[PDB]
Amino acid sequence: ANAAIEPASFVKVPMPEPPSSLQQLINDWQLIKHREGGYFKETDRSPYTMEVEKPVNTEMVTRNQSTLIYYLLTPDSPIGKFHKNINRIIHILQRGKGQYVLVYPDGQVKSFKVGFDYKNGEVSQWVVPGGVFKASFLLPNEEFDNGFLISEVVVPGFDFEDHTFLKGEDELKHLVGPEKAAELAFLAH
Amino acid sequence: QEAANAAIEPASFVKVPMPEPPSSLQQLINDWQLIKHREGGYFKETDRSPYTMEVEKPVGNTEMVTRNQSTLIYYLLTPDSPIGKFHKNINRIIHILQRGKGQYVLVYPDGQVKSFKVGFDYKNGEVSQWVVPGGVFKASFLLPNEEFDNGFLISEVVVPGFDFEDHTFLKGEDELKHLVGPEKAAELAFLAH
Numbered sequence A: 001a002n003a004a005i006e007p008a009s010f011v012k013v014p015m016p017e018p019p020s021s022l023q024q025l026i027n028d029w030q031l032i033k034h035r036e037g038g039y040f041k042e043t044d045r046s047p048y049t050m051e052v053e054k055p056v057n058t059e060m061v062t063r064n065q066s067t068l069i070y071y072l073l074t075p076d077s078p079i080g081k082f083h084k085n086i087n088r089i090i091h092i093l094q095r096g097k098g099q100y101v102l103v104y105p106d107g108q109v110k111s112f113k114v115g116f117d118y119k120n121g122e123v124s125q126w127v128v129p130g131g132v133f134k135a136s137f138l139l140p141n142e143e144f145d146n147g148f149l150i151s152e153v154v155v156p157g158f159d160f161e162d163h164t165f166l167k168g169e170d171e172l173k174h175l176v177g178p179e180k181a182a183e184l185a186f187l188a189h
Numbered sequence B: 001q002e003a004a005n006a007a008i009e010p011a012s013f014v015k016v017p018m019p020e021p022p023s024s025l026q027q028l029i030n031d032w033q034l035i036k037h038r039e040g041g042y043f044k045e046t047d048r049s050p051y052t053m054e055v056e057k058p059v060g061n062t063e064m065v066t067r068n069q070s071t072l073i074y075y076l077l078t079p080d081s082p083i084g085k086f087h088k089n090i091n092r093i094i095h096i097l098q099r100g101k102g103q104y105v106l107v108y109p110d111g112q113v114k115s116f117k118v119g120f121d122y123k124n125g126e127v128s129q130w131v132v133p134g135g136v137f138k139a140s141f142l143l144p145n146e147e148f149d150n151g152f153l154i155s156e157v158v159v160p161g162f163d164f165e166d167h168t169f170l171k172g173e174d175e176l177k178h179l180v181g182p183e184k185a186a187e188l189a190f191l192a193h
C-alpha cells in the first residue's frame, strides 16, 4: 500500500498509438516490445562473468556481472505485467511518471509512485528484492508526453532462466486473496 | 565511444563557481542529505548490495577479495560546485542521467581524449546513459540549463561495489601532461588540481 492504484484511462484501455515523440524515441533508439509490456533495450552487458549458485540441491551457473536496459512505458502499452526475478533489480527514474505494485512472497502488497516530486513522496530511485513479484503502470504526465522512462541494472546480469511470470490471476488469488487479486488483475496475464 | 564529440566550453559557473548553491538545489541537498564529494559535487550512497562476490585483485601476482556486488549513488553538480574532477577507477561505472545537463571529459591511457554532453536531447548528440571503462580518467562539469535550475543529477552503479582501493585521482597537471600534450592539457586544467 501507500500509493493507491487508480489506473488512468489509457492504462485500463491502452491506446492504439503513442504520441509521435515517444514513437521517434522508440524508433531512433530501436527499443522493442518486452515480454512484460512496454519497450526496452539492453544497452550494456558486463564483459566480466561470475559463477553463481542457483537452485535447480543447487547448481553453478555463470552470468555476466551486470546488465543495463532502458525500459519505457507508454499509452501505446502502459503496463509491465507481474513478473518475478531471482536477483534484486535497481531502478533509476529518468523521465516521466509511473507507479509500481509489488507482491511479496508472504502475500503483502506494496504500491508506490515514481517521479521527481519527492516532496510529494515520489521515488526516483528504487530496488526490488529478488523473489518479489512486481508490476508497474504508466501515470499520466505532461513533461514527458505521457511516457515513463527508467534505467534498470541487474546484478548478477539478467538471464531469462532467472525470470518468471505470475501465472495469471489464479496464482494472484493464491497470493493476495480474490478480493485484492481482482483489483490487481489488470496488471497480470 | 559512440557519444558525439563535444566542444569543451565551460561557463561562468564552472571557472568562477558560485559561493553557495541556488535555493532549490540547496534544499535538495539538505533534504536528500547530500555531502560534498572529495572530487567535487555532492553525493550519497543510496544502495550497497547485501550480497557479495569474490573478486581477483592484483597487488603480476594477485589475490582474492570480497566486495559488495554493487553500489548505487546520487551524484549532483551545482553552480557552487560545478566540477567532477578527473579520477580513475579499477572497475567500469554505469552512469544514468536523471536531471539537468552536463558534459564529460574522458582521458584514455593512450592519451586519447573524448568529450560528450549528457542531456535528453539526443537529436543533438546528448547522451542519457554512459559506461566509462575502468582505467579511464573521467572528469565532468555542469552545463547551464533551466529544467533543473542549473543542476546536474545522475546515478552511478559500480559492480563490484565501490571500494577505496578501486579509486585514485590524478594530481595537478603534471600527470595530466604525461597523458596529453602539455598544450591540450592546459585546456583540460580546470578539471584537475
Ligand SMILES: Nc1ncnc2[nH]cnc12
Pocket (backbone or CB within 6 Å): A042, A067, A068, A069, A152, A154, A158
Ligand atoms: N537485460 C534484460 N533483458 C531482458 N529482460 C530484462 N528485464 C530486465 N533487464 C532485462
